[PDB]
Write a protein that binds this DNA or RNA. Structure first.
Ligand SMILES: [Zn+2]
Ligand SMILES: [Zn+2]
Length: 53
DNA sequence: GCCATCGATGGC
DNA sequence: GCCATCGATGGC
C-alpha cells in the first residue's frame, strides 16, 4: 500500500539510525512520538513525499 | 501483548 | 495543505 516492494528503499533491511524518524525510535533511545519508518526505507514510489530523505 | 508503521487529525 | 504528532491494527 505504501510499499512497492521493488525499490532500493523497500529492499533495505537496516535503519540508518540517524534520520529524525530513526532518532525517534525506542530502538534508538527516542520517545517514539513520530512513529514512522527510517527515511531511507520510505518506498521511493508509494511514500508520502515529505517522508522521503 | 508487543512491534512496526499505517491512516487520521488538530493546529498551523 | 502540511507537520508533528497520535490512535489503530496486522502480523508476530
Ligand atoms: Zn533512519
Ligand atoms: Zn518501494
Amino acid at each position: 500500500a505504501r510499499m512497492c516492494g521493488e525499490c532500493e528503499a523497500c529492499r533495505r533491511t537496516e535503519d540508518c539510525g540517524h534520520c529524525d524518524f530513526c532518532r525517534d525510535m525506542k530502538k534508538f533511545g527516542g520517545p517514539n512520538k513520530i512513529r514512522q519508518k527510517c527515511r531511507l526505507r520510505q518506498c521511493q514510489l508509494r511514500a508520502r513525499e515529505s517522508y522521503k530523505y
